[PDB]
Each structure stands twice: as structure tokens, then as C-alpha cells.
Amino acid sequence: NEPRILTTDREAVAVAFSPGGSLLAGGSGDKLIHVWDVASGDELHTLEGHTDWVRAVAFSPDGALLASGSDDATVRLWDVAAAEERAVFEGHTHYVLDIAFSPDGSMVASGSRDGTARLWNVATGTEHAVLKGHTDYVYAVAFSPDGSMVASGSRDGTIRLWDVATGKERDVLQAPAENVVSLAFSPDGSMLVHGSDSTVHLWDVASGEALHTFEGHTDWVRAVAFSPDGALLASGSDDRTIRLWDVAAQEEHTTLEGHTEPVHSVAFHPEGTTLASASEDGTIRIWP
Amino acid sequence: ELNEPRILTTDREAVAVAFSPGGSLLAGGSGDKLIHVWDVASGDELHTLEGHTDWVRAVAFSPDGALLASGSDDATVRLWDVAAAEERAVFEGHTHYVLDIAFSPDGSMVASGSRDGTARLWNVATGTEHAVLKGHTDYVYAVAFSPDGSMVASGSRDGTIRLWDVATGKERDVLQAPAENVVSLAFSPDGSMLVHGSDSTVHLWDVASGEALHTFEGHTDWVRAVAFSPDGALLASGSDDRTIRLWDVAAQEEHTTLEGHTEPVHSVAFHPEGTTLASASEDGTIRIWP
Amino acid sequence: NEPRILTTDREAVAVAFSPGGSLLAGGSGDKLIHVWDVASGDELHTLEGHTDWVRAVAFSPDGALLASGSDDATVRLWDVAAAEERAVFEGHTHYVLDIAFSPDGSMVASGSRDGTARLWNVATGTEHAVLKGHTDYVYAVAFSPDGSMVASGSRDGTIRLWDVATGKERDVLQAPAENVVSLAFSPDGSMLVHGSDSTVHLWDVASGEALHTFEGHTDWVRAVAFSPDGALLASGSDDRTIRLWDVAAQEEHTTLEGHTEPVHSVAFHPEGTTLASASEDGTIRIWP
Amino acid sequence: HELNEPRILTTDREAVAVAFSPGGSLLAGGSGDKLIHVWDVASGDELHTLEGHTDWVRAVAFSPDGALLASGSDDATVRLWDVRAVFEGHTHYVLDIAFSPDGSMVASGSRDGTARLWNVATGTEHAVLKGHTDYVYAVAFSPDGSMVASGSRDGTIRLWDVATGKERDVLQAPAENVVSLAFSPDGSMLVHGSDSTVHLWDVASGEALHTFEGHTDWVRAVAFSPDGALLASGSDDRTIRLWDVAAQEEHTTLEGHTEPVHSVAFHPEGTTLASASEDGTIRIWP
Amino acid sequence: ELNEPRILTTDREAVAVAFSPGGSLLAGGSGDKLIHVWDVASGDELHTLEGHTDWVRAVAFSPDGALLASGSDDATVRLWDVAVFEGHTHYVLDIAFSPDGSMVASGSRDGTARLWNVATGTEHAVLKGHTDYVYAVAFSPDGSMVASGSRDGTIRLWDVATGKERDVLQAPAENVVSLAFSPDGSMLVHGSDSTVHLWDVASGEALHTFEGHTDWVRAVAFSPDGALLASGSDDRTIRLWDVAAQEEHTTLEGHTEPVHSVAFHPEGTTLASASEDGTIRIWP
């Protein structure tokens, strides 16, 4: 079926649902974060303060805060209700390309072009750790659902796993011949998925071995997201499509067409009924 | 960030640095027998304090910013009027090189660490003689008051850090673990932790319990200076490996490596606002970074 | 409540209370600074040495020193008890129109018609920084209560925020239809007020956003001051009045009438029960 | 009569300069709102508003042909308006402008303590008048064009030989700032308006003819009658006073009250007077 | 037992001194980073050798008198014509030419004694076994053995031909700071933070411990005849002892200063002391 559309003046490169499902946050190239009421499709208050493109957004698990990463090299925290900048994190030397909120709510992770992943302490507003190892841009970061581990995806063709507590690297998953552009954990923590150029890979987390490769995209896969029950996987690509795959059977489920430009971010509704995609065509689409 | 805003050029060994309490001035101790005071904003050289006969190994501002103290290989500690309008006293009594000095938070006393194995607590306002603390058969390289002024810590060649109660001159605890000479020490603003710089390593201690909390590894040669950030988040180290490092206290991670220097880094110091740190090196430069 | 009145032989353009509350300094067109014992109403000393109008005055936080700015292009430091000139600062090329003493007591700020804001190190007597950003005259300077920041108000329609230590500009607030003629921080440090033509504007410091505009004045607002508890705002204007505003309610509190000429400066007693104004009518008035 | 005729409005700030056109039919108002207004003396029309200045306009003057107007502003420019302006500059704020009777020259009084003299056609600065130790608040050419007179905050009235840039006389007597100046149509006398009170000076002898007392506050404005018989004073006391130039006695007092009178100008036939006041009113009286 | 001249120019601690083999020239290594050479007969300043970047802790002449070696904190050993360089990973604190003149031994802060062939410039022998900085080295007069003093509190004897440790002399409570080999090769001297010890080479036992100094003993030198031993201390005395007896022979008062280094004239007529002030002194 056909989605709904929301419109931004500029490229929408990041999207996320509030934990309750009632709000939708959109990160854009107008240097703002837009917040929509999902039911009415009305645009609530905007979040301004970033000085460059907003590349990623994520809600706190309690839904009270929103974290954002930007090309201005900063990570900001926003009070959702008040639509206010609550904090600003500095340290990254280059564009911040991804962020993730810990399931705990106490930490934000960021990935940047400076070749590091950083962890920020939400309560104190300080840097908890800098994660060093990658030799190229870090395009994606994601927390393990138990909150103990963070995974980082880099252009150096590696996926690195670190202990959140100590900042220590635990594993390196090799993905050769490729730039890892996106990462996501399954909600059960058993699987990890990464987006590459035209391809989506599945990994068994306990083993660090590759389970399967999903073929069908014809361009860079910049966004991946697991459904809340882990059964479905969504991918966003430069080929303009969004693809759904059946995780257990490891086949194509369906292809979502409609975007006229690259899809930079994909996010499931917490109930699993809806998917949101953001595209360079300046639209956010909600698909059931 | 770790980027550097400015560079100062001195042309000799810059072995000690400290910021004024307001943040606007910088004192530099040099291999010349001189102390320099710089304006941080303009980078202008305000004044040069002469009198020492040998290397100046440590410098400190009084908490009220009116006085500078300097410790030297000539075996003296000198007190300078910052305005420069007035010469001041000199502290004599140490039999060997003085490698460290620290002001008590009230500005009434100064502590000094010498190679003679003694830590001396001198009176600033008063002209009387001072208390002697004895270091354990080995030279004392480093000294620091706790922020509350109740504790003084000393770093020695015995590979231990010593804590005294300032009021009674009583030795409260002994911190052991370093495999070598402890060259620097710094209290957390909380007063809860202590930071140790030694031969290759940076240690974190729980002051109350006298236990080691962590060891920071990453320097490849002797760590000559340490500094605790005002927020307590970060730690700064200077080393003979020619780098300076910033460490995340919680995780013990290399928040940043500052790679401008070509020669050993003898001293590091945080700005009072915690935004920038200054590093001093044998390459005859002072580098300021955020 | 009718105030009490002191006189100067010429225009009184500046006033400030000692931190203890017992003294009142008045800057005038006599080229002198007058000091009054508030309780007795007696004139304790005359500070002489300026060569032109004295435009602004400020006490050191310990009350031992007074700073003054003048049309002679100089900033002077006075020993109050001794009534002696202690230092003279030179460097500004044009009239100095405002001065401020930091809470730290280590730095004096000045704003001049030469388009620059200067910071002077009181202990050493040196020029610490020249702040250059503005493209027109600087009419006001104020320190943040934490002493980390200094703000400058200019004819170029900008308010600028600088780091005191490094002299680096941090922010530029835009107020474009307006010449910024006066500034004050709230004692909290959370808000800033600026005075323009007919209006007093309130800013949120952290967000740099405009909170309110206080309307009622019918001419230039040359002086603004927060009450020590932050609850009240005072404005001095060319319309000859002083207005008090309730900060939280954003409403008019009262209008102080009596002055027969423009009110150039206002200052609160540290207890908050009394206010002093200075006027071109050659009077300083103390109002409860 | 002293009847108040049209009250002229639209300026939104202090009106600090007024002048009649030489032909009598137009009225120019300079204000603190940074503009110059031109009015039809008959009321029937509103004419133009001259915009460009960035700061207070303190003086206006018409060229003797009535085709050009000059203005002085705090923005430090002297602008000649075609009635786009042409511009002239001052190191400091410019407070007074006067055209020579000839119309060949514009004199500008400034905060830099000097009077500038420009050749209108060329635009070339010809002479700088140096001598005052403070702001120059008012300037006027003698009817023969050979002399300029100036009032300053230094409390003096000065006479200059224009061609030679040379100071010829310094008239002293005011205790305070001289705020306005006027030259007599016969050129024999000069009028001072000050922070104390109005004075008359003999041009040839460089002596005081008289002191006019009556005002109870600052005198900001003075203007001679076209026949030279009378003098008008404007004050902070809110009266306009008329004095006999010969006898030196007060003739009449006009109570145009509630407002300080900042500028006054007589009509060319002498029947009318214009006053400027605060807050942007221009008043016309016979 | 007097003393004649005092020698000047060094701006810092003079921590090494050596006479040329044949007469006549004197070398001073200092904290000011340079090596001074002095003409002994005239008491003049012949030359200053510059290049080192850090403190110079040892100097030694080649047996032909044509080359001088220096050890510095800059981690170089340099050979000077009377320059060539060698490296160490750490600070070099001491050097000694073999009596043959074919080898330079260098003791470093890397816990090893380094041995180079001078003519080829190639390092061949590394002596390992010390657990801390090596502060002093000296060849046996036959060149078959090297002795080393370390901060580990030991004196070691090594067989030169095979980089193997032959003996470990223990006893000193603290850092050994200097060592010397007697001309007959029978006795070895240790200078430490408290005392000076004599080690019997054939027996591998301690002949005796010298207890007169009241502070650290920084230097030891054997007389050319082997009869007498000089000790230099922080207490500002130089002490002469009978090697056989081990009894104190004399005390030289310098006083104001701590003696950092001592050396005998090759004829045995003169003794040179180096001090912190940046003075060199000769006594008979």
C-alpha cells in the first residue's frame, strides 16, 4: 500500500519515531530538526541551533530527549516538550554521520568522519570515551540491546565492537571490499546487519560470522533497521527504494517504490505497523 | 577538539607552566634561570623575572593571582610580585634542587618538593621557618594540596605517593603501585581522587581508601606532568615521548593526543575554565590547545 | 515616594553604588567623579584627573577601587579611600562610553566610540585584549556574573559575547532595526537586557533567543539594570523617566517621574530597596 | 499678532533646525528622526521628505536661489539636496551649515572644533577655520560675504575673515555653551544664544552692544528680523522673546509652552516666525 | 697534598674528568652539554667540543691520545678528533676505551653495556644482566674483562670476548655511581650512595668497605701504581685510601662543593676533581 508524505524544503537525511510512536523527528539539510505529530501530520515546533546539515537523530528511551548529529561536528541534546537545546557536545573534528541512544538512556554514541566513535554521558554532558581503531570515516554506530556493547561501521571495511563501560575494543568483524555505510542490531541482540554498496549483510552476533547476504539493491544501502520482533528488515538505498526482507527465511519480502531520490534513513514504528523513510527529495514517507 | 589556537616561542627549555587564576596570564619556567609571564589573549610577553641561578623546574600562581612562586635547581623558592613593582622574598633551606611548589588554597602557605628528600611547608604572610616533611629516603619530585587544603600529597623516587594531613603534619596514607619514580601529582577538584604521573604511566587513586582505581597506558616514555581538568572529566599528561595526552577519567580512554611538539613535553596545565590546556616542551615552545 | 536629590554642577551621566551600599559614585560633565556617603548624604571625595566628561563608573567587587571611563579616551582606576589616582589606561582612540568591573575583580572592560571593546588587567595595568568584531561604535559592555564572558553592545545592531580569558568572540546576537545603547546581565546570568530606541529587550543567554520586548518608553533607553534578586528591571531613558518592569510577568511595575532631562544611568542599591539615577539636569536622585 | 497658525506635524522627534526658503513659500525642518521635511507654508500641500542621513539632522539651510538645500548631521556628513544629494564629510559630527549670501560657499560647523568652507560648484574644501577649543554649534556669513561668525561650546563667538581663514575677533562674555548664532542683515551686529542668555555684538568694534536677560533657562535659538530692528529668542523656559536691537529691551513674550524651543526662523518679509520644538512639531506664528 | 689551580669556564656540573694518556691534556665533561679540553702544563683552555644536546656524563681518551669519546644524556656517544656518532636507545652515562684501543664500551640507561669496534664502527657485544641503569664501566688492564656499576646496586664483571657475565659483586645498599679497575687488575672499586667498596677480582670477594664519607660517594679512582684509591663525595671531601690496608691515608677539603668526579694524572703526581660549580681542580 501507499504511504503518506511529509514535506521538508530540503533533503531529509534522518528520521526517527518517538518511543510512544506519536511523534516523528526529521533531520534535514536546512540545519534543523523537524518534529511531526504522526496522527495529524502537523508540524510541531522545530529545533534550531545546528550550523550545518543534520545527519542523524534519535530519541531517548523515555521519549523526553532527542539527540542529533550534524556536519557542524557536534552532537546536541534537545528537550522534546520544550523544543529547547539542552546540551551541546564537542570533540569531533569532522562531520558527525550517526548517533545512537543507549537503551539505558544514559549514553549517546556518535560516529564521525574524524575516524572515531564517541560516547557521551547524558547526565553530566561529558565525554565518557573516545573509541579509536578505525582508519577511515565511521558511518554508523549502534548499541547492543543489553546496552553493554556499541558497534561501529566504517569506510575502512570493518565493523568494530566495543565495551561501553571500559571503551575497550572487543571484536573486529571484517567486511572486505566494502565500505560499511549503515548498522543495526536486532532487538533481541542475536543479529547484526550492515549496509554496503548494493548489499545488505547479516551477522550472527555470538560467533561474529556472516549468516547471509541480501541482494537486490543496485546502489549504496545507507540505512538498515530491524522490525521490533526481529522478523523483518528494512533497507534504504541510493537506488531510491526501500526493501523489506524476511529475516528467518532470508528472502525478499517486498520493495517500496516512490521516492525520486536516495533514501538516507529508515525507521520502524515501535508497534511494527509502519516504516518511515527519508529521502533527498525532501520528503518523509510513512509506509504500513 | 585537540586543535592548537596559538604557539609561543621561548627558545630554550620550557619546563614548567601555570595559568593565572583568572585565566588571562600564563607563567613559564625555563631552563634559563628565569620566569616569564605571558598574556594568553595577545600572546604578549608582559614581564621577565630574573634572579634564579639555575633551571626553574616549577612555577605557581597564588590563589589570589597577586604572587608567583618558582622552584629552581639553585635550591631556592622565590616569590614574585605579579605587578612587578615590588621584589620579594626568597626561601632558603633546601640543600638540593627544588622540583615542585604548590600554594595552599588559602594562599597562606607554599609547599615545595626537593631532591634532598624533604617537603617544606613555608609561611607566605609570615616570615617564620617552615614544617619539614620527610620523604622516604628518596627525592621528592612532586607536591600538591587538596582543594579543601586539608591534605598535601608528595611524589617521590620511592615510587610512592604520600599523603599528609596538613594540620597535624601526620602521614595519612601511602599510595603504592607505580613501578617507578612518581614525577607528578594532581588532585581532582572534588578532592576524591588523585592523579599520578610516572615512568610511562598515569594512575588514578581513591584518596579516602588509598586504593588504585585505574592505570592509563599509552605513553612510551616518562610522564613528566599531569593536570586534572576543572570539571574532573579529563586528565592531562606530558611525556618524554614528545606527546601530550588527554584522558577520559571514567573510561581511561585517550580522549586526544596532541602531536605538535618535536621534543619532550615537560609540563601541561589546564585553563581555569577547562576549555584549553597549555603544553611546554624542550623544543622551546609553549602550545595552547582546546 | 519622592526621592532624594543630589546635585553636580553639570550633567550627571553615570552612577554606581559601592558593593556594601554605603557609598555612591557619580560621574559628571564636570570631568570629575563625586563620591557620596549615602546615609549622611555628604560628599566624601572628588576624583580629579579626567580631561573630559566622565561617562561611566564601576566599583571593584571589594569596594576598594573605582574604575571610570571618559570622553578623554581613557579608563582610570582610583583608590577610593585615598581618593588617589592609581592608574591610567590608554589605548582607546575615541570617547569611552561604558566600563564594567568583572566579578573576579581582575578585569575592567571598556566600550568606546573607536568601535572596540577593551579588557584591562587591573593587577598588572596592561591591556589584555582588544575585541574587534564590531563594525561601528560600542556603547555598552557588561560582564556575565560568572566572570567568564563579557558582552558588548554596538551601533551596528549587534550584541557580541566574548571569552574574557582568550578574547575570542563566542556569539553574535542580532537586533537589527536597533542601535544597542545599554546592556546588563541578570544576576542569575540566564538573561541579558539591551536598551535601544524606545525599547528594552530581554534575551535568553543560553539560547540567544528574544524573550520579550518591554514597551512604554518614548525615547532612547540609555541605561538598564537588574535588581539584585533578578525580579525587577530598571530603565533610564531620554524621555526623562525611569521605568521598573517585572521580569517574570513581563509587565510594567511603575514609572519614576521627576527628572527634567534625560536619564543616562541607573543603579540599584545592593539591598534592592533603593535605586539611583543620573540625569542631564545635573541631579542624581535616589528613589525607594 | 502672535496668533498661532498651522501646527506642522509628522516629524517623530526633536526638531532642531528650521528655515524658510528665500522666496517665503517653503519651510525646511531638520529633526532627530534623521530626515529633513519640506513644507508648503500655505498648508495646502505636503511636500517631500529627504532621507539618507543616519543620525540626527542638526542644521538646515537653503541656497540663495532656493534650488538647493544643505543639511548637517551627526552622521558627520553635510548633504546638498537638489530641490540625490551630494555629500561632504567631517572627521566629526557636523552641527551647523550656512550658505554664503553669494551662494558660492557652504560653511560647516563641526565637533572637531573647526569650521569648513566649501566651494559649492567645485565641491572643493577651501579653508579650515581653527581657533575654537570645543564643538562649533552655529555658523553664519555676513551679508557682504566677507566674514563668517561662529558659536561654540567653548563659550565664545568668533569672527573670521573667510577668504584668508583668519580669526578677526573673539567675543567673550557668555559663561556657558553658545548654542545659536545670527548675523544682522545690516552686517553691523551679531547675536549669541547661550546656556545662560542672549548677547548682541558689534562687528566693527568687536565689543558687546548688550545682554538680553529675561529667559529663565537655556536659550537655544536666535534670529534677527529682516529689517534688523528685532531679535527673537527661543528657550528651554518655553518662551519666544522679542527684543529691540537698538534699545536692547524686551518687547514681547510668546508662551508656546510645554516644550523647549530649539530653533526659530523669521519669514523673509518678517510677518511670520517658525519655531521648532520637541517631538516633531513645527509652529508658525505672526 | 695541596692544590694549585682551579679551572674555569664550565657553566654547570662537571661530572666527568680524564687525563690524556701521555701527559698533558685534560678533558672535562659537563652539564652545560660540552666537553672542555685543557692544557695541563700552562693551565690554559685549549678547546671546547660542542654538539651534544644534553648533559655529558662521561669522557674517555683513546690510548693513542688522538681521539676522545663522550657519553651524553642525548643518547649519543661521540668520538672527537684531538666527530662520529653512535646511538643508544636511552641515555649514555659512561664510556671506556679498551687498553688495546680497539673497543669502546658504553653503559646506558637501557640496562646494558654496549661494545663497539672503533675502527669499523660496528656494534658487536651487548652485555645484559643488570636490572637498572649502568652508571660506570671500566676495562681490566689486559682488556679481557669489563667491570660495570649499576643503579641495581651491583658491580658486575664480564668476559669481553664472549658477552657473558663472569661475576656479580653484591653488598651495596644503594645506587653504585662510579667504578675503577686497578692497574694490576687485582682490585675493583665501587662508589655508592653511602660507601666505597673494594672487590678482589680473583676471589670475587670484597676486600673491604670504606667508611669515612658522610654522604654519597660519586667518584672513585685508582692511583697509577695501584697503591692508593681516591673517593669523591657529596660531603665535599676527597679521601685517599691504602688499597692493601684499606685505611684512610688523607682527606682533601674542597667544601663548598660536592665532588662529582675524580681522576689521577698518569704519572700519579696530580689529582683532578670536578664539581657542580663548573670548576675543575687539580691537586698534587
Residue numbers in the entry:
A (entry chain E), C (entry chain B): 451 to 738
B (entry chain C): 449 to 738
D (entry chain A): 448 to 530, 536 to 738
E (entry chain D): 449 to 530, 537 to 738
Source paper text:
The tPkwA was the first prokaryotic WD40 protein isolated from the Thermomonospora curvata, which is a thermophilic actinomycete isolated from composted stable manure. In this work, we expressed and purified the WD40 domain of tPkwA (referred as tPkwA-C), and performed a systematic study on its stability, thermodynamics and folding kinetics. In summary, our current studies showed that tPkwA-C, a prokaryotic protein is a WD40 domain with reversible unfolding property and thermo-stability. Structural analysis and biophysical characterization reveal tPkwA-C is a typical WD40 protein with extraordinary thermodynamic properties.
